[PDB]
Each structure stands twice: as structure tokens, then as C-alpha cells.
Here is the input.
Amino acid sequence: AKAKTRSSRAGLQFPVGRVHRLLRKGNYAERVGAGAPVYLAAVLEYLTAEILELAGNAARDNKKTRIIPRHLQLAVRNDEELNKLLGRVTIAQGGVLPNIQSVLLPK
Amino acid sequence: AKAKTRSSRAGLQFPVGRVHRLLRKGNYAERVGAGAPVYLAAVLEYLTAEILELAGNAARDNKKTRIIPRHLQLAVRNDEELNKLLGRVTIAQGGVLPN
Amino acid sequence: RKVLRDNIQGITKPAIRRLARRGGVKRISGLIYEETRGVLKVFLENVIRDAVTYTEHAKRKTVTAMDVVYALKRQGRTLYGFGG
Amino acid sequence: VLRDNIQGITKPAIRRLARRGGVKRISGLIYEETRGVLKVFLENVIRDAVTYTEHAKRKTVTAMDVVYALKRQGRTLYGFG
Amino acid sequence: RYRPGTVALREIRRYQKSTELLIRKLPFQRLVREIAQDFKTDLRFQSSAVMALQEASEAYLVALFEDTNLCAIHAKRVTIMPKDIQLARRIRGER
Amino acid sequence: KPHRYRPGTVALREIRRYQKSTELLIRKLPFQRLVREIAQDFKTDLRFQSSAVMALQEASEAYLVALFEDTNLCAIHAKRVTIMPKDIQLARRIRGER
Amino acid sequence: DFETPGSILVNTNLRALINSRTFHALPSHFQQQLLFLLPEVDRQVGTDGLLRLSSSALNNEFFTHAAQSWRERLADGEFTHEMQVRIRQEMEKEK
Amino acid sequence: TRKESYAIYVYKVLKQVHPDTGISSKAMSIMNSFVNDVFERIAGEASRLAHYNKRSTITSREIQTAVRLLLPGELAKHAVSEGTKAVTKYTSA
Amino acid sequence: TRKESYAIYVYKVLKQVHPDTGISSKAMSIMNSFVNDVFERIAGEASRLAHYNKRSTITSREIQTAVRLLLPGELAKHAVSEGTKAVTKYTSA
Amino acid sequence: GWLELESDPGLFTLLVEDFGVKGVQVEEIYDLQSKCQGPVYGFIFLFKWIEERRSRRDDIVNNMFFAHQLIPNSCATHALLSVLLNCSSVDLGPTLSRMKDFTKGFSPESKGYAIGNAPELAKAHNSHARPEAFHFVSYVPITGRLFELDGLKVYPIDHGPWGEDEEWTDKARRVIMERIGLATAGEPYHDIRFNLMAVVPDRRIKYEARYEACLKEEVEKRKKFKIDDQRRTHNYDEFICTFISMLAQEGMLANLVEQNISVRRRQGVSIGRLHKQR
Amino acid sequence: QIFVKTLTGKTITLEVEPSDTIENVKAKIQDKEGIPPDQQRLIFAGKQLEDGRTLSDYSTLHLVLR
Here is the structure.
């Protein structure tokens, strides 16, 4: 009885099995369909890929090879849709976007 | 044996049985203790009594004997704690306070 | 059915004046009308988008009041008086 | 016994915080109002966290309690689990 | 002839004590149908849904106008201008 | 006379310096003492993990920075470059915190 | 302006403004006229026969609270002429 | 199909507090919506509280803690007092 | 005991996207917390959506509708497309 | 109607003298120590009456004179009546004697209504009128028992027999401690607006019977009470206006005001226009 | 250091000087408790202290409220 992961069937990286287990244990519904965890895992993987792309670009702009929370803050806040999704979220050691009001500039 | 409602045992007006049924059917937890529905019914009764008493006072101050949504809005917005509880809530046909 | 266009101008200037008067506004400028039309259009777009999504999920073609109430609740603007 | 440690938030600290926020010129009465606002916010968050801790019959406030209290307020915080 | 600003005060006192709707039903209904036509074609609305939408929109606009008046008073003026509305929406975090 | 900068230049320099950085702007011990003093009212003999006070400080700093941004916006709207307590009160009134 | 809420006096510390030194700077006639509005005991019968301000006549718990209340009432708009006319009409209604 | 509501219990409470005051249908619907909203808020908070401690039972303690978390100040104190009195009276009956 | 997390999967995705870029531990914790937050949001929304229609199960359709409700615009479109492709590939295998 | 009266022992002493009672005075009790209170005929206590939110949930009636408070701001007057008319060791005077004789058999509501229509009592009460609510209650020894009279209560509450009719301080001290421990909800350091006063027989008469310096002290206290009554009933509006006008005309007023400014300026608040300007 | 006792029995420790007036002590009491000095009266050795005098003119003192 050779075991093949459900994640390997759909070409995903995330643990579909773990997602299914968390769905069952979370009391979200009386029963859980089989197709739901695949969809959820694909969505999570896509969002993580987008975040990592933007963070990597921001980190490379700073001439560093490690993604630090500052890069994540810059990537999240510099994108309209990601900022809208995470409007109420605070990131530890994130800093602020560089911007200065026009009127405060010297005359 | 004679049927004696659980709401009568605790001296409450709200239905304990209906609260217990809703808690069980709402998937809020795997198991529901026996004491939880009584406590929840008491809390709901207290809140309803407070709101209704304030609304009745407001209606009496308006020389009317029937409570209308405007009276509910006036009662809620004139109480600091109740207004803080319902800060994000909009009441239909509520109007605004004279200010 | 007829095609509905330029209904944003259906929110007449006196209506916006009355709405401002209810809010306690004593004096009103001229651009407030167009700004209010834009804001109302945006708010209605968001709410109706959520309501239509809810309705389409239920495989219906008639938008009920409960869909609107659920959309408002999901947007943080819980509305009483129509159930739920 | 600790008393009147709200003065521990010195004027230069508030000045630095305002500088990070893009403030150019600051009045003299800002500091007291800022201290009051900070005290109110900390009171609310600590009250919720202490209630969470009391429910679990523990005597040590953990990071998860603070994170949950913040999430209840709508101030979701990442990085601490 | 009343002095300017008197009729405004009387209208404020009159409207702040009444709870009826302030927008005409049919224009709002047509606007709602026009907006909803884009997302999905051939939709139908119960009258209660339209009423709920109208009530919510009126409440939102009233709150926005109160905040705009507060901003305008803060700016040492008695006339509201679109920058007041923009500032209020920016501070609320809605933009 | 020694070198003396015009007013407002050091303000811009500090603004850039503190906007390009990410470290904590409040010293650890005063904040920890404040947190313990505030918590003394609800329950006695409470003990705090270090990560708890760290998270509290992070949240407080973020909240204060956002409040100061909104206050600066209001002050600019009032045709002024100096923030005053009326601006903070107006910001907290509009936000719904009061 | 000694009766409009917009006066500087509403933001002025009156208790330190009016004191023994302020009383001394006044001429004797003005001092006697002001003392005639004081109670009968705060006016100590001096050796010369002229009534004098007691050492604890103005620095009083009652006088300080009276000054604070007067400033607060000036803030509230009680002392304006229109409110004075309204008070006179109310007194006419009473008697 | 029956559609349940809290109309009769709210009316009983109203007659308890104001013997001579009636209520229109719209206010009744508003009160029913408010009751449902508060019920679901407290139930969800209690569910999350029970889930955090890795327990599987909702007892009176979780409801009390949720009430302390939601209602501010005097409302919380009075609600706790009422709940404790009701449970104490119920437990011996 | 053990504390599970999504570290290795995020590491694999990062290596797929940017082969030469590393990630600090704090950034890893932030990413894990973000993943957990998104998962709980979507699961709760799907649960409420299923309960609204009085159903008993969570299927792919509820997840798709919840995704449409939460993610705005282009994120929603891309997520729906990716989910559809993954579901089709899984059902074909 | 009637106006609130400040919780001052001199004010109550002047009220008692206005009512016609002689040989008795009101002293202030500044602490709960047993030495603080000696031979007394009645206790008057003020804590509050704002606790009216959680609402909605015996032959001695013919002997005790209890009048219900059917008019506002008469709590002090009702407390004084409870202390006096239930004590037969003081000269009630013709006015209170006639009031007691006429209103002895009436119901507490009728007693209060008849009190409210008494001209002399109303004039004395309103003589101190100025041109969070607080309430007055009384503790009295009646027939060897402690009775608490409050105008908002149905009838006096019996707190048990006295140790003795002449010596009744300590039994009421514990009742006062209980009352304090309820308003502050445990920790006594929450509310401190309590006030306690004792209606005691004239100290001067006792000292003379038995102290010349004590008589001087009593006379000076009475003079101070007279001064306080005059000040509380004096309107300083014209006095202040004349003083400010004279200072402005003389000239130094402007500089004095610029010097004592009370609020820090240049911070949003409109400081206002100069004195005697517009 | 001086001690102030209230009707409830609360103990207040104040750091004062012999030249401090009654007004200064009442201001310090207000700072520690929030009760305005105009509603505060001080009694020492069974005698109530009048306004304007100093401590040296007349330790545990008693505070009363009006």
C-alpha cells in the first residue's frame, strides 16, 4: 500500500491533508467535502506566491539577499489590493512608507 | 410527572429550552453544559429589560402609549453604555438626536 | 425593460440639501452635490456587489432583503428592522 | 510600589514618534494628551488580556493573550504567533 | 424676507425631529437597478431589499455629513466644501 | 558665531532618519514599569512574559504613529504646520474612539 | 466688555487679580465704596474709624468659589444684556 | 412552515416593566433582531474562548467570561449578578 | 510537545519563486501568521455561508463564493482561476 | 421650589435658630472615633441619592413623627424635623410646637404636605438660597431604639435597641460604618463626599452650668456662621463689575490681567478680546 | 513627611515644609486625590486650620469635605 499525497496529485506545495484535518477539527461545519481542501490550498499558495514575489523584489532593491519584515511591510503597503486586504493588520518591526507632506517642505 | 418548564425553575421569562436547542444546533461547541443556557437567557432578559424600560420612559415623555422605533433610537443613543455597545448598529426609521 | 442611464442625476440637489440639513449643516457649497453623488455611487456599488454575490450563490434570480442585510453585516454596518 | 510611571514616556520619545509620523512642528500641550491617549489604549488592551488570563486560571500573561486581545479590538498583530 | 440663515435653522429643527425618508423612491430604485445591472443581467428585487438599501444609504450619508460639518467648523468656516468630505473619508480610513 | 541651522531643517532630517528606520522608539524599562503599574489595578502579583510586553509596545507604537499621521493631516487641513491638542481630539472624534 | 463670554476675563485668574494689594492700590473713596458691598464683619472697624479689609476677607473659601462661579457664569453667557432682560422678565412674571 | 421569534417573551418583559405600554410591530422586529444579534455575538465569543483552551464544552464560566469581554462596565457587572443569581436559584430546584 | 507550522512549504514556494533569496526567522513567523489568518477568515466565511442556506457540508462552491467575497478584484479573479485549475487536476487524478 | 442647602453645621444651626428652637446647636463630626461624639440628640448624614437606576425590583407608626419628602430639596428640612420633633428635651418653640400638634395624627404623606405649606419653615429654608445628587438622612433615638428617618423611605427603620437612651453614640457608629462601606463598594477610598453632623445641646449653656474661652469660641463660631450666611446670600455681580471698571479706568488692570493669564496661549483656544474694549 | 487621615480612614503621606501654607497642603491633597482645595478643610490637634496660615503657625492631620 504505497502512499501518494493528495497535494502531489494536484501539483501543489501546501499540505492538502493538513488543511482537511484543520477543516474537520475547526467545527466549521458538520461535514466537509473532498473538493474544498484542494481549492483552499491552491488559494493559499497563490497568495503566498504573490506576497513572496513582491517581498523579494523589495529586498533586492535594497541590495540584500534575505527577506526581513521591512521588505514585507514595503511590499504589502506599496500594492493597492494587498494593502486593501491587510488594512487593519500591523506587522512587527515593519516601519512606515517613506512620504513627506508637500506643505512641510521648505519654502 | 407533571411538566415543569426550565424557565419556570430559574424564574426567567425567556425560553431556556430554545436557547439550549440553538446552542446545540449552531455548531458552537462539541458539547454544551447544562448551566450555559440559563446564564445566557438571564443575560438576554436583563438586556431586553433595560432597553424596554428606557424606551418606555422615552415614550412616556412623548405623551404616547405605544413604543415606536424613534423611541428605541432615542433611548439607545441617550445611554452611554448602550450606545457604546451598539456603536456600529443602524436602526431603521431611527432618525437622529436633536443637537 | 428600458435601459437605465444617468440615474445618478436622479438624486436631486434639494434631496442632498435635506440630507445635509438633517446632519446639521448650515451652509453648503456648490461641489458638495457632485461629491455626494460620487460617494453614494461607490457605497451602493460595494453593497450591491456583495448582495449579488450572495444571491448568485443561492441559485436565485430575486435579491431578497436578507441578502442585503447579510452584505451590510459583512461590511460592519449591521442593520436592524428587516430581520436577522 | 510603582506610582506615576506615566512620566516615564519622556518628551523626546513622543517627539521621535511624531517625527516618524511626518510631523514638522509640535506644540507644547501635545505631550499630556498623547500620554492620556496611550494610557487609555493600554488600559483597554491590558484589561482584555487580563480577563483572558483569568479565564485560564493562570498567573502569567502570555503573548497569545495579548494577541487575542488585540484581535478583539480589530488591531490584528503578526509576528508573535 | 427673513435674514439668510434663518430658514436653514428652521429646516434643521424641522428635519431633526422627523424620521421619514428624504430621497424620492423611484429615482433611487432606478439608480439601484442601473448599478446592479452591470454585475449580473436580469435581476429582480423585492421591495424590502430596496427599502433596506435606501435606509442604509441615508444613514451613511447623514453620518458623513455630520463628520464633514465637524471638519468645516474645525477649519473656522460655516460652509462645507468637497475637501472637507475628502478629509473625513481619508480620516475614517475608507480611502 | 558657530554654525546654526534654520528652523525646520533638522525636522526634515529627523523625519527622514526615523522614517527609514524600524527600531523601537520607546525605552524598554519605562514602558515595562508603566504596563506593570496599569495591570496592578486589575489583579495582584501578575507576571509577564517578555514577548507580551514586546507585543504591547509594538501595538502602542503603531497606534501612536497612525494617530500622529491623522493629526498632521488635520493640522494641514487647518492651514497650519503645527499640531495642537484640538487636532488630536478631532481625529479621535472622527475615528469613532470618542 | 465685562459681560460677554468672549472677554479676556473668562480666561483670567481673578482670585490673584483681586487681593489685598489690588485693594490697596485703589483710592480711599473707591475702597470705601467697594467695601460697602462686603458683609458687615469683613469690614473691620479700624482705629481711625474707616472700615478696613480683613486679613482673611478676600482670601476666602467662599470668595474664591464665588469668583470661580462668576467666571463660569460669564462663560455661560448669563451676564449678557439679552439674558439680563430675560431674567428681568422672569422676575416680573414671578412678582 | 413555522418561523419562530421572541415576540411573546419580549412582550412579557414589557408588561413586567411597563404595565400599560404597548409596542408596534416594527419595534418588535427591531427587538427580535437585537436579541438575535446579541445571542450570536456571545455564542461566537464563548466558542472561541472554549477553543483557545483546547476544551470541548461550553459551561457557564465561558459564558460569564464572554459577557465580561463584551458588555462594558456596569452592564457587565449587572449581567454577571443576574446570571449568577439565576444559576444559583436553578441549581437547587 | 510539538508545535506545527507552515515553514517548509513557504520555504519551498520562495525557492520556486526566487531561488537565490533567503528569509529571516521573524519574516517566516510573520508569513505563517498571515497564512493562518487568511485560512481562518476563509473558513469562517464559508461556514457562515453554508449555515445561511441551511446546508450540512462545506464544498468547493462555498469556498469559491467566500473567496469572491473576501479578495478584491484581480486577486479574486486569479485565486478563482487557480482554484478551478487545481480542482480539475485533482478530480482528473 | 426649594433649593439645596450646603452641608455646613453653621447653616443647620442658623436653620434651627430660625425655626425657633433654643438651647441646641449643630456641631460637625470630623471622624468616627468614639471620642468625637458625646451627648447628642440626633445625627444627620449625607451620602447621595443618585442610586435610583436599578429600580422596579407595628403601632410605632402612630407615635413617631415621620414626614415623607413630597417636595424636592427638602431633605435637610425633613432631617431637621425628624431630629427635633421626635426629641422632647429641647425647646421646640411655638412654631414647631404648633406644627407638631396640628400634624401629629396625619399620615406621613399628609405630614410632608402640611410641612411644605408652612410659611415660616419655607422662609427659613429659603433664607440661605443663593441668588451627582446628595441626600440627607437622620438617625434618632426613639423609645430606647435607633430609628433612621429618610424622606424617600416608607417609615423609620429600626436598627435595634440602644445600649441606653442617654448613651447612644457607639450603636450608631457601626451603622455609619456600614453605610460608608456600601456606597464605596468595599475599598472605602472611592467616595468621600460623606458628611456627618450632630444636633447637640447648647455647649455654652452646659459650660456656664459647669470655659469662658469656650464661650468665646462658641460666640466666634456663631459670628463665622453669620458671615458665611451673609456671603452665601450676597450677590457679587455688581461688586465685581464695579471693581473691574475702576481698575480699567485707573489703568493697571490691563497689565495685571496680561500678567495673571490663566490659560497657555497660541494653542488653538481663542484667548479673547481685551477688557473694556467691545 | 506628614500624614492626612480622612473620614473613611485613608492615609495620605505628604512631603511638605514648615513654611508651607494651608493652601499648599490642600493643593498637594488635590494633586494626590483630585478633590479641589475649596472643598477641603484641615484639622490639627482638634482644631480646624484657617486659610492663609502656615504649618509652623500651629504629624497626623484630618481632612474633611464640604
